[PDB]
Amino acid sequence: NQYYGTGRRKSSAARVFIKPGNGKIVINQRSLEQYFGRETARMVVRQPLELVDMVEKLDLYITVKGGGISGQAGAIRHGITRALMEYDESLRSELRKAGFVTRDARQVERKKVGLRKARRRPQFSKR
Amino acid sequence: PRRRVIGQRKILPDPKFGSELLAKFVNILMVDGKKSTAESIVYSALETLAQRSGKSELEAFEVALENVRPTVEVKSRRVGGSTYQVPVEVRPVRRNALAMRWIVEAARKRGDKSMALRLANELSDAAENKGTAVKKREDVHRMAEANKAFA
Amino acid sequence: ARIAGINIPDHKHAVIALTSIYGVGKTRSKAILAAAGIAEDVKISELSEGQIDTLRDEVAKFVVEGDLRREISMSIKRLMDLGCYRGLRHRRGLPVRGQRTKTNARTRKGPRKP
Amino acid sequence: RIRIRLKAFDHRLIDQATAEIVETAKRTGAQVRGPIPLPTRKERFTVLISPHVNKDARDQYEIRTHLRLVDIVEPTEKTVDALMRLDLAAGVDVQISL
Amino acid sequence: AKQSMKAREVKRVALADKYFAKRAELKAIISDVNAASDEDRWNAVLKLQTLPRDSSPSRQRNRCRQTGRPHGFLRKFGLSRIKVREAAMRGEIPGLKKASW
Amino acid sequence: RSLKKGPFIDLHLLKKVEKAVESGDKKPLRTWSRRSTIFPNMIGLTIAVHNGRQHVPVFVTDEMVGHKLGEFAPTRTYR
Amino acid sequence: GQKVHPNGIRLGIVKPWNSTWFANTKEFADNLDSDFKVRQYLTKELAKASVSRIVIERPAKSIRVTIHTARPGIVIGKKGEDVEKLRKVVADIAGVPAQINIAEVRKPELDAKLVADSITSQLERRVMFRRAMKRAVQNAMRLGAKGIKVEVSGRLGGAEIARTEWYREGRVPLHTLRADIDYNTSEAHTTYGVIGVKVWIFKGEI
RNA sequence: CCGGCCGGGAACUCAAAGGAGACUGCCAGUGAUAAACUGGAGGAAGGUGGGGAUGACGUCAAGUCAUCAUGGCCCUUACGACCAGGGCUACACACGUGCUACAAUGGCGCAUACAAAGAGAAGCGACCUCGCGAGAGCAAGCGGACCUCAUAAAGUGCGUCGUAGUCCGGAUUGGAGUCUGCAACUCGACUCCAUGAAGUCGGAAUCGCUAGUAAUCGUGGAUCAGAAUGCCACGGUGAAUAC
RNA sequence: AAGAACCUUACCUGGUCUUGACAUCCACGGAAGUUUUCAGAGAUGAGAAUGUGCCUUCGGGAACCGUGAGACAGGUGCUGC
């Protein structure tokens, strides 16, 4: 039966679907490789799939919008570990031990009045 | 800080091969938040290092790191009005993070063609310890061993 | 390799070579080679000597390198003879297009000497 | 057929402005979709605070304009006069499409 | 603020409604690309000076409706930056409260 | 560097230029329009343009045509 | 001056708005100036009628003024004629349909505008300021208030230098946001200058 | 016609409402059996979770009488009122706050991926056609989760540049223009063509920041006919270090 | 100053005006307004045209405009000690 886990990260929002089958990954009807897997941090989406067995065990249908390049990549990694609900008490002990289900909020701070961007005070001069 | 004794951040390891150590070496070399352009320096400086050494991937970088790695460093502890340089042993966390910084200072100077070629020549000149980054380390050890009378 | 009054670089691509001529930059030099028929990835020394004079009657279409200078010097000496606003700014060594003169305008004024 | 969209500055006053138009329409007539929440157009006004210098200190305000839909589907003749002269909940401006 | 300046503005409001938005088509119809670009168009830049120096909506300074403060204006309220603050704190503008997001 | 269609003049300058040509060049003109160009019929006239506290007389030459009247009157006196 | 206005911070939480109507951004300035004309006029005429707040709600291209006054026997007058004689001149400056609606307050020493006008009127006619200051404290504390702070500022006695003197009883917490504080401010144009009375009334906890 | 494009779907993202959640609550140790502290568990979140709003009595006879209101003084054929041109944009100079740089983790060219937040009716202005371009003509749609502004840029792929004041820099300037407006000379922004300045990391000194921060990258808004590198907001990438 | 080409604008030079650009009261005229000419840099100075209504005490209304008379308006003038 097809399972689901959402995941979101820093103004991005993934929705991870998952089926038992071959080890392919479809993201927004692109390949995992040609969407950003040819780019840096290609395997933060494969980080939960390294620690518990991926090899050719289950495929991953993904669509994701919002955020940026590394913003969507963190949204998938949080979406897979919530999609990993099949073996939850066999998975989410050591999967929690490596992190991976902490949503890790840390939004951008709003720009403050008087400040140049949210911390940067403009150039104090004594005299 | 004043009140805190707080810890440090769990950095993410290197993607291409497992190394949390040179995942820090990317971030030291990284300027202006461009990490992807900093990594393509780091990899292309390693295979040209692996070309002329033969040591495979990070065992070449490990030899060149321990020859710039310092043991004793000086910091000015003021005692009763006076102000003089006091040698102290570097903590083992700082010990190689200070070593990875001095390569990047030696590799941003000595401008030949490109940063991947620049940083590969400083890793090579540190392996047989004749470069700028080992010139930095010896002078730090020159600050100790003459001013080692204070401890 | 010696189209008009100067143009002598070497080991340099043909469009970047033509910028040496006073009166042609990057848009005109891409049109000098588009009308003559020279691909812009070749150098001057690789460019054949029978194709160089194809550039010479192509740079004959712009006002270049000797005529542009005394068409510019003619208009500046014209304005200084009308006694206009702009003519008085050229006569005093002050910015003309309407820039700040209180603090900046040190390109026009020269070195900050006193 | 009946597109009721209505907007106001207050969320707890636009709630029963929408709940009662459901109670008026769905009871004596039929077939209403429901309150569709339609994201708020927050409009911020950053103004200075002093009658002179101190650019730095400011007060930042906003108006929040909440929106709703109703979407009554069929032209029910018990409902076509349920909107006429039964338009309570002042402070709310309502717009209709036919 | 200088009761002349408050009455100098309400002249420019009414006298712009008198001439332009009816005789602002004297530039739109006639300073326009057609076959009448020589004789009629030169009569459009002729008669647009026959109108007074005012009535052009570029002379609206758009002042505060209570004090006539020319600066700090807000188009949403019609007030300066001070009288929008004193009225919002009193509860005069519906919906306008302090924002902290 | 402006104004695609219609070189600009004020009417009180234009309708006074037409009077100064056909009656003949007699005396300088008191004008307040610095915003007006110099139409080609103005060559030979002696118009005095109000710089702000004077009216400096400027005898129109043949090359002062594209420019404006106030272009030939320094408004700020300096050293 | 460093404190927030106590009403404006609480407009979403406990205190309501004085004006309640929706208007889009085309007419919102014109619909706000008309609100100001019906307010400075209606405070000028009802100066002796002890008005605390007026509520301007505007449904369906029509005005509905709501006058909260301590003495509504002046506002209705005989037969309700002064109700009508106000309603005529509101429709000149608001938009032609109109209603006014009196709403009495039966404890006039708990509205902050009425307590401020009680001190303002006495400072006009040369009463001693500390007597007027403290008599509005004592009359309000016995009548059921859980706190009152009053504060006068200005010349206050024909002094050369201006000084502020304030007197409080009870518990008046101003940083608590559920705290219902009645705050309003009047000024007293004496012949030595302007004296500014302002008065907080802590009415209840939530 | 693979465009959620359409039938249909209400699961999911989302959108606003209504609730749950975090309290040193559990556990361990130290502690005067107290307050609390250190460590762990569970948990999306751990001890005021992050950020903001919120500014005590008072200090400086701090700032503002040029937003407004105001005691006194003074003008009241004038210190008031109207108009056209001018000035606030002057420039031997000195300082502050900024943006752009001095390049190769870069410039240019071609191709290509991923945003959030705002605004719109004398307004925002698709498609089409013209112009190298700023723009124009035409004419739909939208007072809007739908229509427009609006292609995000850094990134990545590919090619070249070869460390030179250079294909760095984009100052100054000449010519030709566009748009707004009655009007663009004083004194607007922008586009095209040409020009090709100083600058090769900056003396004594000195400032900001401990996390989605610094840094860098672009986007939107207010004021506004036009006129920002300023201000105020938004998301992209993303550190180093605290003994 | 969340935005100086004109306006803004308070400043300067010159051209004009005095119960006044804005307010109230009184007495007289005139329905308000709409069409253009001429002179002037414009403000203004005359025109030539056109319109003449809603309520009847019918010596008048109200709205608006013009004029004269004085109360006075007006002041981004001064003092934030």
In chain G, where are the structural domains located?
A: 16-106, 107-206
**Residue F6 contacts E where some CB pair is shorter than 8 Å:** yes
Edge to edge, the sheet with strand F56-57 lists F30-31, F48-49, F56-57
Give the integer Cα–Cα distance in Å for B141 and G44.
Answer: 86
- On chain A, the residues whose CB falls within 8 A of the CB of B35 are 40
Place of tokens 């919008």: A65
- For chain G, strand residue ranges (E) read 19-20, 51-57, 63-69, 98-104, 147-154, 163-170, 180-189, 194-204
Specify whether the CB–CB gap between B120 and B50 falls below 8 A. no
Q: Which domain holds residue D73?
A: 1-98
Give the integer Cα–Cα distance in Å for G111 and F23.
Answer: 83
Specify whether the CB–CB gap between B22 and B61 falls below 8 A. yes
Give the integer Cα–Cα distance in Å for B29 and B41.
Answer: 9
Give the integer Cα–Cα distance in Å for G121 and G186.
Answer: 10
Give the integer Cα–Cα distance in Å for C39 and F9.
Answer: 51
Closest-CA residue of E relative to D9 is E95
Give the integer Cα–Cα distance in Å for B57 and B41.
Answer: 14
Classify the phi-psi angles of G55: left when phi > 0, otherwise alpha if psi is within -120 to 50, otherwise beta: beta
Contact E89 G25 (CB under 8 A): no
Give the integer Cα–Cα distance in Å for C69 and C83.
Answer: 22
> Strand G51-57 to strand G63-69: parallel, antiparallel, or no bridges (unpaired)?
antiparallel
The partner residues of G184 in beta bridges, in order of sequence, read G199
Specify whether the CB–CB gap between G63 and G87 falls below 8 A. no
Q: Which of D17, D3, D5 is nearest to D86 (CA)?
A: D17
Enumerate long-range contacts of B119-126, CB under 8 Å, 24 or more apart: B119/B29, B119/B41, B119/B42, B119/B45, B120/B44, B120/B45, B120/B46, B120/B48, B120/B49, B123/B45, B123/B49, B123/B60, B123/B61, B123/B64, B124/B49, B124/B52, B124/B53, B124/B64, B126/B64, B126/B65, B126/B67, B126/B68
Single-letter amino acid, residue A15: R
Judged by DSSP in three states, A41 sits in coil
The partner residues of F56 in beta bridges, in order of sequence, read F49
Judged by DSSP in three states, F10 sits in coil
For the CA of E98 and the C1' of H233, the distance in angstroms is 16
Tally of residues, chain B: 151
The partner residues of G36 in beta bridges, in order of sequence, read none
Give the integer Cα–Cα distance in Å for G159 and G165.
Answer: 13
Judged by DSSP in three states, F7 sits in coil
Give the integer Cα–Cα distance in Å for E18 and G63.
Answer: 30
Nearest residue: Cα versus C1' of H214: A120
Give the integer Cα–Cα distance in Å for E37 and F6.
Answer: 9
Distance set, CA G3 to CA D50, G128, G129 (Å) = 13, 28, 24
CA F29: distance to chain centroid?
9
Q: Which of D5, E79, D73 is nearest to G28 (CA)?
A: E79
Give the integer Cα–Cα distance in Å for B150 and A30.
Answer: 65
Could you give the count of Cα atoms lying within 13 Å of A104 in the half-sphere of its Cβ?
18
DSSP count for chain D of H helices, then E strands: 1, 4
Specify whether the CB–CB gap between D71 and D36 falls below 8 A. yes
Closest-CA residue of G relative to E88 is G8
Between the two ends of chain C, the Cα-to-Cα distance in Å is 47
Give the nearest nucleotide to A12, CA to C1'.
Answer: H115
Residue of G18, G29, G39 with shortest CB distance to E77 = G29
Place of tokens 């990875």: B100
Give the integer Cα–Cα distance in Å for B100 and B69.
Answer: 8
Specify whether the CB–CB gap between C12 and C47 falls below 8 A. no
DSSP count for chain F of H helices, then E strands: 1, 3
- With b for 16 or more beta-carbon neighbours within 10 A and e for fewer, the G63-101 pattern comes to bbbbbbbbebeebeeeeeebbeebeeebeeebbeebebe
By what technique were these coordinates determined?
cryo-EM
Could you give the count of Cα atoms lying within 13 Å of A98 in the half-sphere of its Cβ?
17
Q: Which of G117, G126, G132 is nearest to G185 (CA)?
A: G117
Single-letter amino acid, residue B125: D
Chain I nucleotides near the protein (CB, 7 A): 1-3, 5-10, 12-14, 21-22, 34, 37, 40-43, 73-76
Specify whether the CB–CB gap between A7 and A82 falls below 8 A. yes
Residues 6+ apart with CB under 8 A from B32: none
Residues 6+ apart with CB under 8 A from E99: D42, D44, D60, D61, D62
Could you give the count of Cα atoms lying within 13 Å of E59 in the half-sphere of its Cβ?
17
Residues 6+ apart with CB under 8 A from C57: none
Following DSSP, what letter does each residue of E14-68 receive, concatenated?
HHHHHSTTTSSHHHHTTSSSSS-TTHHHHTHHHHHHHS-SS--GGG-----TTT-
Architecture of domain G16-106: 2-Layer Sandwich (3.30)
Q: What is the CATH number of the domain that holds D43?
A: 3.30.70.600
Give the integer Cα–Cα distance in Å for A72 and E45.
Answer: 59
- On chain E, the residues whose CB falls within 8 A of the CB of D42 are 99
Question: Is the CATH number of domain G107-206 3.30.1140.32?
Answer: yes
Query: What is the largest distance, in Å, between two alpha-carbon atoms of chain E?
Result: 61
Q: Which of C70, C109, C106, C103 is nearest to C89 (CA)?
A: C109
- Best residue in G2, G15, G22, G25 for a mutation probing chain D (most D CBs within 10 Å): G22
Specify whether the CB–CB gap between A14 and A75 falls below 8 A. yes
DSSP element (H, E) containing D45:
strand D41-48
Nearest residue: Cα versus C1' of H123: G26
Tokens of F78: 């300096």
Judged by DSSP in three states, G118 sits in helix
Give the integer Cα–Cα distance in Å for G96 and G81.
Answer: 19
- Best residue in E69, E96, E100, E101 for a mutation probing chain D (most D CBs within 10 Å): E96
Specify whether the CB–CB gap between E82 and E69 falls below 8 A. yes
DSSP element (H, E) containing F21:
helix F11-22
Domain total of chain D? 1
Give the integer Cα–Cα distance in Å for A105 and A109.
Answer: 12
Helix axes B36-53, B21-29, angle to 10 degrees: 120
Please work out, in degrees rounded to the nearest 5, the angle formed at the alpha carbon of residue A7 by the alpha carbons of A3 and A12: 135
Specify whether the CB–CB gap between D68 and D37 falls below 8 A. yes
Radius of gyration of chain E (CA): 20
**Residue G19 contacts D where some CB pair is shorter than 8 Å:** no
Distance set, CA G177 to CA B45, C31, E88, E98, G206 (Å) = 61, 72, 18, 13, 9
Chain H nucleotides near the protein (CB, 7 A): 11-18, 42-45, 49-59, 61-64, 66-72, 80-98, 104-106, 113-122, 132, 136-137, 143-145, 152-157, 160-163, 167, 171-190, 192-197, 206-217, 221-225, 231-243
For the CA of A13 and the C1' of H219, the distance in angstroms is 20
Alpha helices, DSSP H, located in D1-98: 11-28
Specify whether the CB–CB gap between D32 and D72 falls below 8 A. yes
Alpha helices, DSSP H, located in chain C: 14-18, 27-36, 49-56, 69-82, 85-92, 106-109
